[PDB]
């Protein structure tokens, strides 16, 4: 049964019940990036894994996962991650589930694996190159490394030890918030030769119209949404889409950055994740 797929990926994260309130009322959403991740991936057809933590209870709730082919690994916690976001925007950890350890990485299978956390202290950063140890190309999201949970509000703070840590991985994804506060700039090519010189040697940056990856030059594509129902899991559909390209399909940098591009924009004419009704319009 087991090891005997290299030809798969693994993404490590939490899940979460996610609460938006927007002038008042309460909305409920199943998901955490790892979901959003891991049904990309699934559907561009690279077989996939989820190792993420929750209570028993919640296991149902996220369902969707396992009614998508997706194999999800629900460790056991004794409280499931939920945040709340009041809408500028804040956003509130009202509750974590236990973080990763050593021992929950046994669970890893395939050629490449994502480190896709929702808050700092989720994934602890001593562990990223044990990590490096098993897996051949290992990829983590800055989300988990700058946003801080500080008396319940996740608020954005630098990473003190990326550049410790910032060498064992294969590709780092940050988001334009993410990248000033790593930084110190704005300008997000500059952010990108910054992180780059911190140690990260592929470098997938999100911004609101766009993609832009560098490993010592840029690739850029562009891409675009419906309606803003259809922007919420961007970031996650466009990570996914890159390595499927690039680490699956043997793309170049180059394609596979256009191609993560595409699989977003035809992700976002819709809510929710990408679609088996999609894939004919990423081409």
């Not at 993410?178 to 990108?192: H, K, M």
Request: proline residues 3%.
């Amino acid at each position: 049964i087991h090891h005997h797929h290299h030809h798969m990926i693994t993404f490590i994260g939490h899940v979460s019940k996610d609460v938006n309130v927007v002038d008042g009322k309460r909305e409920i959403a199943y998901g955490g990036g790892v979901v959003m991740g891991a049904i990309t991936s699934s559907l561009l057809g690279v077989k996939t894994k989820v190792i993420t933590k929750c209570t028993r209870e919640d296991v149902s709730k996220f369902s969707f996962l396992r009614d998508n082919g997706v194999e999800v690994v629900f460790l056991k916690s004794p409280r499931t991650t939920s945040i709340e976001n009041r809408y500028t925007r804040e956003s509130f950890l009202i509750s974590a589930a236990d973080p990763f350890t050593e021992s929950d990485l046994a669970f890893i299978e395939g050629e490449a694996v994502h480190i896709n956390p929702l808050w700092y202290g989720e994934f602890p950063e001593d562990l990223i190159p044990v990590l490096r140890r098993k897996v051949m190309f290992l990829s983590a999201d800055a989300q988990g490394f700058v946003r801080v949970p500080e008396n319940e509000k996740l608020v954005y703070r630098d990473w003190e030890m990326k550049e410790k840590y910032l060498k064992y991985l294969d590709l780092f994804k940050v988001d334009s918030r993410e990248a000033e506060t790593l930084t110190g700039t704005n300008d997000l090519r500059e952010s990108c030769r910054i992180i780059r010189s911190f140690g990260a040697k592929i470098i997938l940056a999100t911004h609101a119209s766009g993609v832009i990856v560098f490993d010592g030059n840029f690739y850029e594509a562009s891409f675009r949404s419906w309606s803003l129902e259809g922007r919420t899991g961007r970031g996650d559909t466009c990570t996914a889409a890159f390595l499927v390209g690039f680490v699956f399909k043997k793309m170049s940098i180059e394609k596979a950055t256009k191609f993560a591009a595409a699989v977003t924009s035809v992700k976002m004419r819709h809510p929710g994740p990408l679609r088996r009704e999609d894939l004919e319009a990423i081409s």
